[PDB]
Amino acid sequence: ADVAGTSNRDFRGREQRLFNSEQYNYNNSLNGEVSVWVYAYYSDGSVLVINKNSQYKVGISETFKALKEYYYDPETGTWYNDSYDEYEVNQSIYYPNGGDARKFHSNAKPRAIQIIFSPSVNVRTIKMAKGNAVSVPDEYLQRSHPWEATGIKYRKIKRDGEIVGYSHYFELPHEYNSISLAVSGVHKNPSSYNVGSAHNVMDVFQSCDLALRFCNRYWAELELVNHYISPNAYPYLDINNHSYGVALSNRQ
Numbered sequence: 001a002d003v004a005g006t007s008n009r010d011f012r013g014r015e016q017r018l019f020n021s022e023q024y025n026y027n028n029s030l031n032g033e034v035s036v037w038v039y040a041y042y043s044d045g046s047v048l049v050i051n052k053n054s055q056y057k058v059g060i061s062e063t064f065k066a067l068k069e070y071y072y073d074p075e076t077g078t079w080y081n082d083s084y085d086e087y088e089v090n091q092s093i094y095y096p097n098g099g100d101a102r103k104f105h106s107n108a109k110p111r112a113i114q115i116i117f118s119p120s121v122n123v124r125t126i127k128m129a130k131g132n133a134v135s136v137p138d139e140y141l142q143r144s145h146p147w148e149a150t151g152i153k154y155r156k157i158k159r160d161g162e163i164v165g166y167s168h169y170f171e172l173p174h175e176y177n178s179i180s181l182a183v184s185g186v187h188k189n190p191s192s193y194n195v196g197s198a199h200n201v202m203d204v205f206q207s208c209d210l211a212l213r214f215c216n217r218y219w220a221e222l223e224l225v226n227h228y229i230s231p232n233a234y235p236y237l238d239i240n241n242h243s244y245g246v247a248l249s250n251r252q
């Protein structure tokens with residue numbers, strides 16, 4: 001045989017490069033996944049992740065209460081969370097002076113949000129409804145457009161010059177930063193075959209039932225990077241502006 005890494009007869013080499021290229025290109029086909037992640041950062045350094053994976057379109061919608069530390073995974077809060085005092089905190093966030101809490105500031109409120117989409121999203125389709133604490137997009141229902149198109153604010157997460165994902169990050173450092181949150185994106189479709197046309201619309205309806213959700217709170221950004229992002233070949237941007245993910249297109 002020819003010698004490895006010296007000719008066009010390195011079939012092991014050509015097959016490795018096609019295997020990676022096929023994964024990149026399948027994800028971008030109308031048969032592939034589109035994915036969204038919401039990360040909520042708490043003052044104790046822990047991070048809640050909500051992930052949704054689906055064909056054609058994908059999104060996540062959470063209340064003010066559901067984004068607070070210990071709502072999901074309350075069994076981790078035993079001796080650190082006063083669940084009753086946190087009910088009173090909620091009454092004082094819904095209406096000024098409406099509750100009887102024993103804290104000025106709940107350490108369970110998120111300090112920041114990162115939204116990440118898979119590289120299979122079309123960024124011009126991204127929509128976000130960032131509501132007040134009683135789930136109203138813009139002050140009163142009567143004057144609310146139900147979303148903002150925020151694609152222009154998304155940064156490219158890059159590895160080896162390939163786009164591996166898209167990031168929108170915003171801090172909630174002020175006492176008045178009390179939010180509900182929904183986000184939504186559509187899978188790329190550079191074709192003129194509308195996946196929602198009469199021929200395929202019931203498959204999009206089935207995609208709504210088939211979407212898979214994941215929810216977990218990690219104790220540290222390091223634990224998130226090591227045991228969630230890296231093992232699953234997911235894109236990520238850390239507090240130091242360091243990019244994570246795997247470049248696949250035309251690569252060994």
Ligand SMILES: [Cl-]
Pocket residue numbers: 029030031
């Ligand atoms: Cl296709």
